[PDB]
Scaffold this motif. Structure first.
Motif, mmCIF file in Angstrom:
data_model
loop_
_atom_site.group_PDB
_atom_site.id
_atom_site.type_symbol
_atom_site.label_atom_id
_atom_site.label_comp_id
_atom_site.label_asym_id
_atom_site.label_seq_id
_atom_site.Cartn_x
_atom_site.Cartn_y
_atom_site.Cartn_z
ATOM 1 N N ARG B 166 41.939 82.764 123.886
ATOM 2 C CA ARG B 166 42.163 84.128 123.420
ATOM 3 C C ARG B 166 42.445 85.096 124.557
ATOM 4 O O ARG B 166 43.014 86.165 124.311
ATOM 5 N N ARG B 274 43.708 84.518 117.282
ATOM 6 C CA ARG B 274 42.329 84.300 116.851
ATOM 7 C C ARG B 274 41.817 85.557 116.149
ATOM 8 O O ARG B 274 40.908 86.248 116.613
ATOM 9 N N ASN B 275 42.441 85.852 115.008
ATOM 10 C CA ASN B 275 42.094 87.060 114.266
ATOM 11 C C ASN B 275 40.646 87.017 113.796
ATOM 12 O O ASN B 275 39.926 88.019 113.865
ATOM 13 N N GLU B 276 40.200 85.861 113.313
ATOM 14 C CA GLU B 276 38.820 85.695 112.894
ATOM 15 C C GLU B 276 37.949 85.280 114.079
ATOM 16 O O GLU B 276 38.435 84.988 115.175
ATOM 17 N N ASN B 277 36.637 85.263 113.840
ATOM 18 C CA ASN B 277 35.682 85.072 114.928
ATOM 19 C C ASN B 277 35.813 83.697 115.571
ATOM 20 O O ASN B 277 35.739 83.572 116.798
ATOM 21 N N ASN B 279 38.205 81.014 114.563
ATOM 22 C CA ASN B 279 39.397 80.222 114.306
ATOM 23 C C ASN B 279 40.640 81.037 114.636
ATOM 24 O O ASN B 279 40.602 82.266 114.724
ATOM 25 N N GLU B 280 41.746 80.326 114.838
ATOM 26 C CA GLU B 280 43.059 80.925 115.019
ATOM 27 C C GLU B 280 43.986 80.450 113.910
ATOM 28 O O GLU B 280 43.997 79.265 113.567
ATOM 29 N N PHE B 281 44.757 81.380 113.353
ATOM 30 C CA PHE B 281 45.713 81.025 112.313
ATOM 31 C C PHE B 281 46.753 80.051 112.851
ATOM 32 O O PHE B 281 47.299 80.234 113.942
#
Lengths: 1441, 441
Positions: B166, B274-277, B279-281
């Motif tokens: 990230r 890594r929009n979420e804590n 995981n990355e889309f």
């Protein structure tokens, strides 16, 4: 052992060590049975020691002797080879102690030595997973060291070798190519291995298999610690199997051994099977077999190969794959297509069959489908008719044996029974009939297997039995039976099975009875040669069981069987007397072992062969002729069978034994006859003792005229035996009298214990016996007179009332019988006779004394059961009073002839005389009425005689019965009181005062007169009596009198004494006087006891039994310092322990007993506590409702004086410091009172504590010095822990930190001191204060500074550092964690005899809390008494309070 | 795992000599505990760690005690600190220049433990506590990929990349594209005389760093280079010339990594952020001129054989394959494995049925609980009457008897066609018996 075995053992032991290898080399193979290693202990030890001598000649460390003797290598090579040969066919291999010298052979430069040693090691380690017991011998050497040979052998792989050396932390190449000198070229073995790899490579094949054998050994040790992975399985296993395929026999043998090692592992098993590739029809092992059958192979190599093959078939999946390959077709064709193959090769074929045919069922089904059984029949016919009509061939005969075993075990299993369909269709009957008709030329095992197969097939379907019957087979069996049976265990074992299979046909039963073959089984039992085998195995049980099966299922000829067995019994009876005892012992053991089953079975039709008469006569004659040990199981089962025999019919058996004993009585008087009587009463005593229930008819036979007359004749004969000492020794006479007495008392006990016996029936026997014995008593034969009167004493023992009620000693029925005999007049007659013979100086005073004591015991227990003795009742003293007068006369007659052997009996007479008084059957009133009775005067004069006797006894005899209940009554007369007081036996008086109060009241008057003699009386008993009398009189006067103690005035001073008892008694006197003065006004003046205290401290340095001395010193110092309020509060606190229990606690007795310490310490405190805070005591009337220390009056000045005493010797300093510890524990507030200057003296404790280091243990130490230092440090630890002062702790920590950096030992010891200062925590808040202080003082800085400033590069410096870590680690961890949790942190986050006695006692000394200390301090005055009179009066006070 | 604060009980002067001695000594596990405990407070912690790292820096780049042994001892001490309480790694985030110093001091022997040390350090990125991510100087660390590492070192490198993705996706991918390019070019140049075992290091590094690229994802700008890289005819040349010869000449053990690499090079995906804590889309990219489908169709038999050799490849590298190529045996084994990791928490309960009617009692005692509990329940059967077989046999016979009873004549819930069965008609099935079908399910 063996015959040729023993020859080999002795030849190996004795032959010269030069000729040892040559003689050894002749041993090529093991064509014999297995053995045990115990027979070669000599050979094993000799070989081990010669190997040790050789290797020490070589060096064992560096192999300096590079040019080495060829004789030595040949010697050790042969030794290892034939060691392998022996151990490969041996038992008890865990004792092999020659393993200790084999690793030098393993790492030897000689490769023959290495291959031999590694092969031996591999064989031994092969059975690790099975035997598991050889590891002890294996553990002599390290297994991990063989990892050096894991690297594969290559043609000079690397000329550079890396070695690992510590400290330097480097690994670099060493010179190998130099080889200039044979000396310099755990790592030494690895370097030698590298040299052997590199320098010489011409003989690399042998070391190429040395690496392989070492890998195999590491496989055997533990497969987990092995490099087994994908690479090893994928490379070395293919390489080994390629070696097996191609390379020569010598090293492909090692490859085969390693393959066995691999496949026994059972890991990666599917991969191993799929890789080794025998699944193809041209797979490996059958390809090797094709070679072996086609091309000639060495015999030993062939044997190794075929053993490997047998190992292959043993595994399940392995033999499954082999069968799937088509091995069955191969062997079938090999057998049925060519007969020119060698006999031994076909033998190896049939062992292969014996393996795989039974290993799995699928090959069995395929073989049944393939009809190879017919081929087997054909080849069997060919083999036998080649053998038949021709001379004996060893290999041919054993191959026929192999055929017999394969067919027998094939028929054995019901899962393998599918082959019994085409049995008759083939020519099996013709071959087996030929074998039977010609069995004289065959091995017995052949016959055994044949018979087993025949019987199993017949039992499989007895429908086809006639087809065999008209085949003439049984005729051939008859011809075989014409030949006498051989020395075959299994043949004889299984013969009854075939015989029973014949009994499956009734006509065969008819014919076997007609031809009488069972004669052979009957005659088998008298053969010494076969007796050994019968001992070895369970032949007797098998024959017995077969007999019951025969008689139960086929009882047709049971009469003939009974006739034959009884004839055999008589036969075996016949030759017993004229034979060696041991042979008959063991033969009879086996015979009765099989008799045990043979008859008396619970199964029906067994009763048809259980004759009581004939067999009883035979067994009685047997027992009457030979002596039999008791411990043997022969004895056990013969006892059993005779018990069933006698239980069937008691009457006839006892009549028969009676007439037998009478008839043998009428014979000549001989010693062997005496032994016969000895054993016949032995057996009758056995059978009577074991008998539980008895018919009245048996008792009638006992009282029948025959039994009584034979018993009386036995007695007459026994008396006649005393006539001649030469024929029968006097000791033998004593033994026979003892056994006769035992028998007579046993039978009398049986008849009397027998319920509802006729009284006169018992009387005739008993009276006859007793009158005979008493008539015999006064004869010339006085040697056994004592024995005879002991016999009548035992008669008095047995004719005892049941006394079933506990604590009951009274005659129930026998009393009237006894004085119906007028015993007392006989007793006085014998008494006056004893007196006269004493006057006639024909008796030693010792023997006369023992006679007196024995008669005294006789009278004692005679009168023990007599009712209402010395009981003033009008009716029953018509004779009882007369007996009392007789007893008084007797005891008066024997006044001056009483010693230690008579006192117990005479006291028992007293106890009988005063039963009602001592057992309080009175209500304390009728006894006070009946003093005007003749019984009272008689018992009083008896007691007068008694006391006269006692006062004529020295101290040793008095101490024996120094505590008896009757003395509470004997000395009740104050005349006797002053008499014994003037006799100086005051301990009796002490106990009487303890238990009775009237004598204590007399002592009250006595005290002032003897107050002056207290000083320098030198009598411990006198002084302790004085002290204890004062303590009881004071605490009794406290009960409502309060005035008696005031009248007593005086003053006592003590003189010097060397006897410890005197000085401790004086100390106890001081204890009592001061303890009474502190509470009560006493007019006896006493000085300061400190003089006596230092006297105690001086004398304990020399005296023994320090426990009493030290405990009295501690209790006295605490008592002196302590005050009244402190004592009262402590007593209340202690009572709270049982106060909080809220139990039932119904009886006041438990309350007093568990709180006797509080009772003795201060009656006022306990009294007020129970009056105010009353307990949960029922008190015999319903129940009662129920529901930081500061002390004053202490004396710190004495503490200050004691503190600076600074004594000299060891033990008194120990005592001073122990007292200091106890006082500071008890009253820490004294330390708060010390002078601000005095603390300088703690340097003494710090230094003398620094004398010894317990952790770093030095030699030349003193255990007393060690405990001195430990207690010195304990003082400081208590100061820091159990005390709550701050400034003194600050000063002492300042001192200890100043003294710490002086030296290494000071640093270590003070670091420890700080550690266990912090560890053991008395209170949480105190520990928090301690942590705050220790953090505040910055001690960590100075201690760590001294830690690294002194760090020296030293060997034990590491141990010093690891010891030092614990304190600094702990404190640092404490200083990091918060204060709340830091408290909960924890760690890791006859000179010799007395020396041992004092060593254990010093550790026995400990820190005593208040409770048990008070309990034991009042124990001294309590003297372990369970109830005193003060307890009773105080309990009454509590009840009325 | 949380910051600890207490009174500063130690002076800063003595710890210098103390760390000297612990460096100049052995059996320091106790000394390790000593240093860890004394470093409890923040100031002492910071000073001690900075002193030790400066000493280690001077031990190598600047150079009794040898520099190498003192360096390894100091590295072990730093690891021992950073592992426990997770707060001594936070000092690295507090400084961010000591990290630069330690990464600069890295020789060949350094990496063997420096990889573990840096993986532990990466915890300062787990909380994203850097506050200065612009000056970390990572390209040296990413270039030390060219050195020789092992499996555990690779795992530590992977977790460090997971921590630092990230933050340095652009520059990490910028170096990785060139590294993968040069690796594949080297494999391409030597393919005429390539060895799968002598250059097994090459295939290891290629597949490893391509997997690291996958974990890294792809950006929009690098797509030109990425599509260039996915069109290397080395794949075709191998599979058409060298694969036929190496099938009959060399061991397939070293050849399997090339198949993994061929799967991976087309398994490359697209990470957006890594929009979420945690995981990355991820989005799947496409290949236009590729005949990669043709290649996988060509040697589909070999693909299925190698998948049968090891099903675990599907969870590590073979995840990018389409299940259509896989046979149902390997697919079913993979399905069993996939469904058995999410075994969840399993409570144990008892089951009681009667031989007369197992189905009825089982239905009664199984409708009461929920789907999740009955899924996770460990059925400890208790047959009434007979108690002579273990719990596993009880469950097996319970299942067999249930199977018999659902097709029993009395229940008639399903009508038989022979070996198989079909549910009975709606007219024959009573309305109250529909819940029996849920029970069957």
């Amino acid at each position: 052992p063996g015959k040729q075995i023993s020859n080999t053992i002795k030849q190996l032991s004795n032959l010269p060590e030069e000729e040892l290898p040559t003689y050894l080399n002749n041993i090529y193979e093991w064509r014999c049975a297995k053995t045990d290693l115990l027979y070669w202990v000599d050979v094993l030890d000799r070989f081990d020691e010669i190997l040790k001598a050789v290797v020490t000649e070589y060096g064992l460390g560096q192999f300096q002797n590079k040019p080495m003797k060829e004789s030595d290598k040949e010697m050790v090579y042969a030794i290892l080879k034939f060691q392998k040969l022996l151990v490969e066919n041996s038992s008890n291999k865990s004792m092999f102690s020659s393993f200790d010298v084999v690793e030098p052979f393993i790492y030897s430069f000689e490769l023959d030595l290495a291959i031999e040693a590694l092969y031996l090691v591999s064989f031994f380690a092969s059975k690790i997973h099975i035997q598991r017991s050889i590891k002890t011998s294996m553990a002599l050497m390290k297994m991990e060291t063989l990892k050096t040979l894991i690297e594969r052998v290559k043609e000079k792989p690397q000329s550079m070798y890396t070695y690992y050396d510590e400290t330097t932390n480097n690994c670099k190449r060493v010179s190998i190519k130099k080889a200039v000198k044979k000396g310099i070229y755990q790592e030494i073995r690895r370097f030698i291995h590298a040299i052997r790899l590199h320098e010489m490579a011409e003989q690399h094949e042998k070391l190429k298999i040395i690496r392989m054998l070492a890998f195999s050994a590491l496989v055997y040790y533990n497969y987990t610690d092995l490099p087994i992975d994908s690479e090893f399985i994928s490379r070395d296993l293919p390489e080994t199997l390629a070696i097996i395929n191609t390379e020569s026999y010598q090293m492909r043998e090692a490859a085969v051994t390693m393959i066995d090692a691999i496949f026994r592992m059972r890991i990666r098993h599917s991969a191993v099977i799929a890789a080794m590739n025998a699944q193809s029809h041209e797979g490996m092992i059958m390809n090797l077999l094709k070679k072996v059958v086609n091309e000639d192979v060495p015999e030993h190599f062939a044997i190794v190969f075929f053993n490997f093959l047998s190992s292959c078939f043993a595994s399940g999946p392995c033999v499954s794959a082999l069968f799937s390959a088509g091995i069955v077709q191969y062997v079938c064709n090999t057998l049925r297509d060519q007969p020119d193959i060698s006999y031994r090769k076909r033998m190896r074929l049939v062992m292969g069959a014996n393996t795989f045919l039974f290993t799995l069922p699928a090959p069995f089904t395929w073989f049944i489908s393939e009809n190879g059984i017919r081929i087997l029949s054909k080849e069997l016919l060919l083999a036998v008719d080649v053998a038949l009509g021709n001379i004996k061939d060893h290999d041919l005969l054993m191959y026929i044996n192999s055929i017999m075993k394969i067919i027998s075990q094939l028929f054995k299993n019901a899962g393998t029974a599918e082959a019994m369909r085409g049995f008759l269709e083939g020519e099996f009957p013709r071959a087996i009939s030929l074998i039977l008709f010609h069995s004289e030329e065959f091995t017995p095992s052949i016959l055994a297997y044949l018979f087993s197969a025949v019987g199993d097939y017949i039992h499989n379907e007895p429908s086809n039995l006639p087809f065999i019957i008209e085949a003439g087979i049984f005729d051939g069996f008859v011809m075989c039976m014409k030949k006498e049976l051989p020395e075959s265990p299994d043949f004889l074992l299984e013969l009854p099975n075939l015989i029973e299979a014949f009994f499956l046909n009734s006509e065969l039963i008819k014919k076997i009875d007609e031809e009488n073959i069972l004669d052979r089984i009957f005659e088998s039992f008298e053969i010494v040669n076969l007796s050994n085998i019968i001992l070895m195995y369970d032949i007797g049980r098998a024959y017995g069981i077969f007999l019951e099966n025969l008689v139960r299922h086929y009882p047709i000829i049971s009469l003939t069987v009974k006739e034959k067995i009884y004839n055999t019994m008589k036969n075996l009876e016949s030759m017993i007397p004229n034979t060696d005892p041991e042979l008959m012992r063991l033969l009879l053991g086996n015979l009765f072992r099989m008799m045990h089953r043979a008859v008396y079975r619970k199964t029906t039709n067994n009763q048809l062969i259980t004759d009581k008469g004939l067999l009883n006569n035979r067994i009685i004659s047997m027992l009457m002729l030979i002596e039999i040990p008791t411990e043997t199981e022969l004895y056990t089962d013969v006892m059993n069978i005779l018990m069933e025999v006698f239980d069937e019919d008691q009457t006839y058996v006892i009549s028969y034994i009676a007439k037998v004993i009478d008839r043998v009585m009428k014979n000549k008087v001989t010693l062997e006859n005496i032994e016969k009587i000895k054993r016949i009463l032995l057996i009758v005593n056995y059978l009577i003792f074991k008998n539980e229930e008895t018919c009245e008819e048996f008792i009638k036979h006992c009282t029948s005229k025959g039994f009584l007359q034979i018993v009386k004749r036995i007695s007459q004969y026994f008396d006649n035996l005393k006539k001649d000492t030469a024929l029968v020794s006097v000791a033998k006479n004593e033994s026979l009298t003892n056994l006769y007495y035992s028998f007579t008392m046993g039978i009398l006990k049986t008849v009397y214990r027998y319920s509802k016996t006729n009284a006169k029936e018992y009387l005739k026997i008993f009276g006859l016996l007793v009158e005979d014995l008493l008539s015999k008593t006064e004869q010339i034969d006085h040697l056994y007179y004592t024995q005879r009167m002991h016999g009548l004493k035992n008669y008095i023992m047995v004719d005892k009332s049941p006394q079933q009620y506990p604590q009951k000693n009274e005659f129930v029925v026998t009393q009237e019988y006894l004085m119906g005999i007028n015993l007392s007049e006989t007793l006085m007659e014998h008494a006056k006779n004893s007196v006269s013979m004493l006057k006639d100086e024909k008796i030693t005073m010792d023997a006369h004394k023992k006679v007196v004591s024995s008669i005294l015991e006789v009278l004692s227990i005679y009168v023990r059961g007599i009712k209402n003795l010395f009981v003033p009742v009008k009716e029953p003293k018509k004779k009882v009073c007369e007996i009392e007068e007789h007893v008084l006369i007797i005891v008066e007659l024997l006044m001056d002839y009483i010693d230690k052997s008579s006192i117990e009996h005479l006291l028992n007479i007293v106890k009988t005389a005063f039963f009602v008084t001592l057992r309080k059957q009175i209500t304390k009133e009728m006894d006070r009425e009946n003093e005007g009775s003749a019984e009272y005067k008689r018992r009083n004069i008896l007691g007068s005689f008694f006391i006269s006797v006692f006062l004529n006894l020295p101290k040793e005899e008095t101490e024996a019965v120094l505590k008896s209940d009757i003395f509470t009554i004997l000395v009740k007369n104050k005349k006797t009181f002053k008499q014994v007081y003037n006799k100086n036996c005051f301990g009796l008086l002490q106990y009487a005062a303890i238990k009775e109060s009237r004598v204590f009241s007399h002592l009250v008057s006595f005290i002032p007169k003897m107050t002056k003699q207290v000083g320098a009386s030198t009598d411990p008993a006198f002084l302790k009596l004085y002290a204890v009398g004062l303590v009881f009189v004071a605490m009794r006067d406290t009960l409502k009198k309060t005035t008696v103690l005031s009248r007593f005035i005086g003053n006592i001073v003590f003189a010097e004494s060397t006897c410890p008892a005197v000085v401790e008694a004086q100390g106890i006197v001081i204890l009592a006087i001061v303890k009474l003065k502190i509470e009560y006004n006493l007019a006896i003046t006493i000085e300061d006891p400190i003089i006596h205290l230092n006297r105690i401290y001086a004398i304990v340095e020399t005296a023994e039994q320090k426990e009493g001395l030290v405990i009295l010193a501690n209790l006295l110092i605490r008592r002196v310092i302590e005050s009244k309020e402190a004592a009262k509060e402590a007593v209340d606190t202690i009572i709270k322990n049982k106060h909080l229990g809220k139990s039932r606690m119904y009886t006041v007795h438990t309350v007093c007993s568990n709180l006797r310490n509080a009772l003795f310490y201060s009656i006022s405190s306990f009294l007020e506590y129970l009056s105010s805070n009353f307990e949960c005591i029922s008190a015999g009337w319903e129940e009662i409702r129920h529901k930081i220390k500061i002390y004053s009056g202490l004396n710190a000045e004495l503490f200050r004086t004691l503190f600076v005493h600074r004594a000299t010797g060891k033990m008194e300093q120990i005592v001073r410091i122990h007292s200091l510890c106890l006082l500071v524990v008890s009253f820490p507030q004294l330390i708060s009172t010390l002078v601000p200057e005095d603390y300088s003296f703690f340097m003494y404790f710090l230094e003398n504590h620094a004398a010894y280091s317990k952790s770093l243990k030095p030699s030349a130490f003193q255990q007393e010095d060690k405990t001195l230092a430990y207690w010195s440090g304990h003082f400081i630890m208590l100061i820091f822990n159990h005390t709550t002062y701050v400034e003194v702790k600050k000063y002492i920590l300042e001192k200890v930190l100043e003294l710490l950096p002086t030296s290494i030992n000071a640093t270590v010891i003070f670091s420890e001191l700080i550690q266990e200062i912090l560890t053991m925590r008395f209170s949480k808040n105190t520990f928090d204060e301690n942590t705050a202080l220790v953090k505040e003082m910055n001690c960590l800085e100075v201690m760590i500074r001294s830690t690294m400033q002194i760090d020296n590069r030293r060997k034990d410096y590491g141990s010093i550092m690891e010891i030092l870590t614990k304190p600094m680690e702990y404190i640092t961890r404490i200083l990091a964690v918060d204060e709340k949790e830091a408290f909960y942190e924890e760690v890791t986050q006859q000179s010799s005899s007395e020396q041992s006695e004092k060593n254990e006692f010093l550790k026995s000394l400990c820190i005593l809390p208040i409770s048990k200390l008070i309990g034991k301090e009042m124990e001294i005055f309590n003297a372990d008494e369970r109830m005193p009179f003060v307890q009773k009066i105080l309990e009454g006070s509590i009840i009325s309070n | 795992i949380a910051e600890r604060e207490a009174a500063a009980s130690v002076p800063i002067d003595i710890v210098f000599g103390l760390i000297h001695m612990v460096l100049q000594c052995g059996n320091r596990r106790n000394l390790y505990r000593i240093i860890h405990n004394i470093s409890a407070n923040k100031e002492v912690r910071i000073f001690s760690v900075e002193t030790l790292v400066n000493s280690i820096y001077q031990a190598v780049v600047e150079g009794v005690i040898a520099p190498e042994v003192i360096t390894k001892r100091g590295f072990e001490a730093l690891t021992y600190l950073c592992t426990k309480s997770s707060d001594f790694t936070t000092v690295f985030s507090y400084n961010t220049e000591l990290i630069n110093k330690i990464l600069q001091a890295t020789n060949k022997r350094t990496i063997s433990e420096s990889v573990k040390l840096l993986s532990t350090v990466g915890d300062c990125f787990n909380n994203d506590k850097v506050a200065e991510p612009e000056n970390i100087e990572v390209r040296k660390y990413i270039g030390f990929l060219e050195y020789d590492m092992t499996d555990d070192t690779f795992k530590h490198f992977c977790e460090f990349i997971k921590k630092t993705d990230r933050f340095y996706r652009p520059m990490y991918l910028l170096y990785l594209m060139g590294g993968s390019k040069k690796s594949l070019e080297e494999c391409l140049d030597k393919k005429a005389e390539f060895n799968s075992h002598t250059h097994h290091k090459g295939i290891i590094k290629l597949v490893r760093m391509l997997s690291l690229v996958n974990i890294m994802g792809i950006t929009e700008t690098y797509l030109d280079s990425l599509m260039e890289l996915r069109e290397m005819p080395f794949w075709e040349y191998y599979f058409n010339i060298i694969l036929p010869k190496e099938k009959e000449s060399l061991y397939a053990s070293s050849i399997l990594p090339l198949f993994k690499a061929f799967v991976i090079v087309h398994t490359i995906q697209m990470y957006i952020g890594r929009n979420e804590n945690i995981n990355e889309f991820s989005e799947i990219p496409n290949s236009d001129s590729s005949i990669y489908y043709s290649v996988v169709e060509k040697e589909k038999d070999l693909i299925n054989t190698f998948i049968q050799a090891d099903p675990d490849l599907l969870f590590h590298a073979f995840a990018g394959l389409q299940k259509k190529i896989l046979d149902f045996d390997n697919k079913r084994i993979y399905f069993y494995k996939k469904i058995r990791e999410d075994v969840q928490l399993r409570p144990t309960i008892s089951l009681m049925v009667q031989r007369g009617a197992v189905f009825e009692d089982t239905f009664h005692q199984l409708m009461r609980l929920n789907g999740e509990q009955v899924r996770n329940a460990k059925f400890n059967i208790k047959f009434a009457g007979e108690e002579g077989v273990d719990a596993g046999g009880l469950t097996r016979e319970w299942y067999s008897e249930l199977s018999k009873e659902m097709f029993n004549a009395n229940y008639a819930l399903f009508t038989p066609i022979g070996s198989s069965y079909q549910p009975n008609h709606i007219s024959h099935i009573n309305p109250e018996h529909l819940v029996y079908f849920k029970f069957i399910g």
